Scaffold this active site. Structure first.
Site, PDB file in Angstrom:
ATOM      1  N   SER A  61       0.770  -1.250   0.000  1.00  0.00           N
ATOM      2  CA  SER A  61       0.000   0.000   0.000  1.00  0.00           C
ATOM      3  C   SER A  61       0.806   1.308   0.000  1.00  0.00           C
ATOM      4  CB  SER A  61      -0.999   0.045   1.158  1.00  0.00           C
ATOM      5  OG  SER A  61      -1.986  -0.957   0.969  1.00  0.00           O
ATOM      6  N   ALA A 312       1.653  -3.566   2.937  1.00  0.00           N
ATOM      7  CA  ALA A 312       1.935  -4.984   3.056  1.00  0.00           C
ATOM      8  C   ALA A 312       1.422  -5.746   1.863  1.00  0.00           C
ATOM      9  CB  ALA A 312       1.283  -5.532   4.321  1.00  0.00           C
ATOM     10  N   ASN A 337       5.530  -9.857   6.220  1.00  0.00           N
ATOM     11  CA  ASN A 337       4.527  -8.911   6.678  1.00  0.00           C
ATOM     12  C   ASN A 337       4.442  -9.128   8.183  1.00  0.00           C
ATOM     13  OD1 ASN A 337       2.227  -7.408   7.298  1.00  0.00           O
ATOM     14  ND2 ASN A 337       0.823  -8.655   6.060  1.00  0.00           N
TER      15      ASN A 337
HETATM   16  C1  LIG Z   1      -1.811  -2.223   1.535  1.00  0.00           C
HETATM   17  O1  LIG Z   1      -0.720  -2.607   1.957  1.00  0.00           O
HETATM   18  C2  LIG Z   1      -3.110  -3.046   1.525  1.00  0.00           C
HETATM   19  N1  LIG Z   1      -2.816  -4.486   1.576  1.00  0.00           N
HETATM   20  C3  LIG Z   1      -3.431  -5.366   0.761  1.00  0.00           C
HETATM   21  O2  LIG Z   1      -4.268  -5.002  -0.075  1.00  0.00           O
HETATM   22  C4  LIG Z   1      -3.012  -6.735   0.959  1.00  0.00           C
HETATM   23  N2  LIG Z   1      -3.037  -7.396   2.142  1.00  0.00           N
HETATM   24  O3  LIG Z   1      -3.553  -6.571   3.245  1.00  0.00           O
HETATM   25  C5  LIG Z   1      -3.908  -7.352   4.401  1.00  0.00           C
HETATM   26  C6  LIG Z   1      -5.283  -6.856   4.903  1.00  0.00           C
HETATM   27  C7  LIG Z   1      -2.853  -7.092   5.511  1.00  0.00           C
HETATM   28  C8  LIG Z   1      -3.995  -8.849   4.099  1.00  0.00           C
HETATM   29  O4  LIG Z   1      -3.034  -9.596   4.455  1.00  0.00           O
HETATM   30  O5  LIG Z   1      -5.023  -9.281   3.499  1.00  0.00           O
HETATM   31  C9  LIG Z   1      -2.502  -7.601  -0.162  1.00  0.00           C
HETATM   32  C10 LIG Z   1      -2.250  -7.116  -1.496  1.00  0.00           C
HETATM   33  S1  LIG Z   1      -1.613  -8.262  -2.529  1.00  0.00           S
HETATM   34  C11 LIG Z   1      -1.625  -9.424  -1.306  1.00  0.00           C
HETATM   35  N3  LIG Z   1      -1.119 -10.734  -1.458  1.00  0.00           N
HETATM   36  N4  LIG Z   1      -2.129  -8.937  -0.167  1.00  0.00           N
HETATM   37  C12 LIG Z   1      -3.993  -2.610   2.685  1.00  0.00           C
HETATM   38  N5  LIG Z   1      -3.200  -2.591   3.916  1.00  0.00           N
HETATM   39  C13 LIG Z   1      -3.659  -2.829   5.187  1.00  0.00           C
HETATM   40  C14 LIG Z   1      -2.535  -2.950   6.264  1.00  0.00           C
HETATM   41  O6  LIG Z   1      -2.671  -2.344   7.363  1.00  0.00           O
HETATM   42  O7  LIG Z   1      -1.536  -3.660   5.957  1.00  0.00           O
HETATM   43  C15 LIG Z   1      -5.164  -2.986   5.439  1.00  0.00           C
HETATM   44  C16 LIG Z   1      -5.617  -3.212   6.687  1.00  0.00           C
HETATM   45  C17 LIG Z   1      -6.083  -2.908   4.368  1.00  0.00           C
HETATM   46  S2  LIG Z   1      -5.560  -3.533   2.778  1.00  0.00           S
END
Ligand SMILES: *C(=O)[C@@H](NC(=O)/C(=N\OC(C)(C)C(=O)O)c1csc(N)n1)[C@@H]1N=C(C(=O)O)C(=C)CS1
Length: 355
Positions: A61, A312, A337
């Site tokens: 993100s 993440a 992560n």
């Molecule tokens: C940005 O880093 C966003 N992350 C994601 O969209 C992904 N995973 O986020 C979490 C909610 C941690 C998960 O493990 O499902 C992602 C993208 S590609 C992939 N394999 N996973 C947002 N970031 C957070 C955060 O605090 O890390 C959120 C709570 C909302 S999504």
């Protein structure tokens, strides 16, 4: 490399890597405008490849900060306006719920409850249209903030439409290149694979998989060197020669909404400095709906702010924080992560110590 910096960085990061069992990590501290690098562990455990200043990490993100700035640049170029309704750049969104939903709402997660993720089943451009047309907002626009990749992700896609460029082409040409982020990619070229670290989840090596609006919401990969350079650019936009980009960076740090002690920018989030870590306060809560107060009109970037963004992917954990007034910043990139609070705590401990 001042011993004071060496000491706080190592005394903070070593315990962190051990408590979180992080395979590899790179840190950059911007001090008085100069960057200092640190690296630990492995980029690839199986092949025993160490993390270096050229290792690419998945930013997750933190990519939204690039998106907010590219959007800011488009505004500065007069190609779009944040006050414009979403339908102005997507006439096919004819569903009535979209009426008073503007690009500003999209960019700041205040559209009315757009979902956290675009569903896996959404592939085609046609699929995306169906998804937004069928979405039913939980709230009126501009009343609540619900962090969502499907929200700023749409903002990114629409923001580059008048330019005629693809999101990636606009990003490379208007942001990466002008800032010499020459090892920052939305898609890693074959020639750079040698430097692409693997992320680790439950011990398995994994890379982010393709998804709709991935480039705009969480798809950028970068090195600790380019990220330090990205931090410097955001700390002192006035040094940037390209006018619309300089303006764009400033617009990304304006305060559009307030929730608690946090302010929502374009990608970046801010809090007034000084601030104690307990206030940052920004973690996960698989979802937290928070009412927001409009900042009318938005406050221009405040120098005495803690500006930051967490990120993440399934196998990577990243974090960026900087304080303009002190010309101070930090970048932490890891291929595991781990809890957001541990990131903020580490960064605060380091920056508070240096200024
Ligand atoms: C940005 O880093 C966003 N992350 C994601 O969209 C992904 N995973 O986020 C979490 C909610 C941690 C998960 O493990 O499902 C992602 C993208 S590609 C992939 N394999 N996973 C947002 N970031 C957070 C955060 O605090 O890390 C959120 C709570 C909302 S999504």
């Amino acid at each position: 490399a001042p011993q004071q910096i060496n000491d706080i960085v190592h005394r903070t990061i070593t315990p962190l890597i051990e408590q979180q069992k992080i395979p590899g990590m790179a840190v950059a501290v911007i001090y008085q405008g100069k960057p200092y690098y640190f690296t630990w562990g492995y980029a690839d455990i199986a092949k025993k490849q160490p993390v270096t200043q050229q290792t690419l990490f998945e930013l997750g993100s933190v990519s939204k900060t690039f998106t907010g700035v590219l959007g800011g640049d488009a505004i500065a170029r007069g190609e779009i306006k944040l006050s414009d309704p979403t339908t102005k750049y997507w006439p096919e969104l004819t569903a009535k719920q979209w009426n008073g939903i503007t690009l500003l709402h999209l960019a700041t997660y205040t559209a009315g409850g757009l979902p956290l993720q675009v569903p896996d089943e959404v592939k085609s451009s046609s699929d995306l249209l169906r998804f937004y047309q069928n979405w039913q907002p939980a709230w009126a626009p501009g009343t609540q903030r619900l962090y969502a990749n499907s929200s700023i992700g749409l903002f990114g896609a629409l923001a580059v439409k008048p330019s005629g460029l693809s999101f990636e082409q606009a990003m490379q040409t208007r942001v990466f290149q002008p800032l010499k982020l020459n090892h920052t990619w939305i898609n890693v070229p074959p020639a750079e694979e040698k430097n692409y670290a693997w992320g680790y989840r439950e011990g398995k090596a994994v890379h982010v998989s393709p998804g709709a609006l991935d480039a705009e919401a969480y798809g950028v990969k970068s090195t600790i060197e380019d990220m330090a350079r990205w931090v410097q650019s955001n700390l002192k936009p006035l040094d940037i020669n390209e006018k619309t980009l300089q303006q764009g960076i400033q617009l990304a740090q304006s305060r559009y909404w307030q929730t608690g002690d946090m302010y929502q920018g374009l990608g970046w989030e801010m809090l007034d400095w000084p601030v104690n870590p307990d206030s940052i306060g920004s973690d996960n809560i698989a979802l937290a709906a928070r009412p927001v107060k409009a900042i009318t009109p938005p406050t221009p970037a405040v120098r005495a702010s803690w500006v930051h963004k967490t990120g993440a992917t399934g196998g990577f954990g990243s974090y960026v924080a900087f304080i303009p007034e002190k010309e101070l910043g930090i970048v932490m990139l890891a291929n595991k992560n781990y809890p957001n609070p541990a990131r903020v705590d580490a960064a605060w401990q380091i920056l508070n110590a240096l200024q």
